[PDB]
Amino acid sequence: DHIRRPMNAFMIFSKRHRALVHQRHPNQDNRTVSKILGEWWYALGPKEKQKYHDLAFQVKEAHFKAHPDWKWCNPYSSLRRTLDQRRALVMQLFQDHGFFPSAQATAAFQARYADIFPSKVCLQLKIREVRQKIMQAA
DNA sequence: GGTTATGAATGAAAAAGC
DNA sequence: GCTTTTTCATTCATAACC
Ligand SMILES: [Ca+2]
């Protein structure tokens, strides 16, 4: 039972609305529920979204007040050309199967470009990075 | 300056072993 | 088929890395 990491705005939103999403989608597993929670979080307006950011701020403040000494712990030329190519392909994946493509369509996308994405975690990260970057500019 | 990797909560699905 | 352990989907914050 070490000192945990404080919840962000989304993890607070997930803690509250996860049981409601599972009620409205009972034949879809928890990993798919996480895809729905993220879809709802993007759908919120600045009014309701700021409510959870303000709630996440107080959690961080109380966390430092309770744990004052806690610390947050954890080809070169063709590298940028590769990264730009990876983001462009994930852009096509979203416009072809939605921003939260099914695990099947995501797996088939990985195999179609198995050379560009040498692993599943490399593709999933790029799916999350590109999607989150589009939503901040909306 | 830009990118990668991590851990926060939660829980069905999978793996392990029986 | 059961119980217990391990996977992993999600955004955000962010240190570690390049
Ligand atoms: Ca078995």
Contact A14, A34 (CB under 8 A): yes
Q: DSSP letters of chain A? A: ----PPP-HHHHHHHHHHHHHHHH-TTS-HHHHHHHHHHHHHHS-HHHHHHHHHHHHHHHHHHHHH-TT-------HHHHHHHHHHHHHHHHHHHHH-SS--HHHHHHHHHHTTTT--SHHHHHHHHHHHHHHHHHT-
Nucleotide nearest to A132 (CA to C1'): C11
Considering the four listed CATH numbers 1.10.230.10, 1.10.30.10, 3.40.50.720, 3.40.47.10, the one that applies to the domain covering A9-66 is 1.10.30.10
CB < 7 A from strand C, the residues are A 8-11, 14, 30-31, 34-35, 37-38, 41-42, 53, 56, 60, 71-74, 100, 103, 120-121, 124, 127-128, 131-132, 135-136
To what resolution in angstroms was this structure determined?
3.0
Domains in chain A: boundaries: 9-66, 77-136
Closest alpha carbon to C1' of C11, residue: A10
| Backbone φ, ψ for residue A131 (5° rounding) | -65, -45
Question: Which method resolved this structure?
Answer: X-ray
How far does residue A114's CA lie from ligand 1's centre (Å)?
Answer: 31
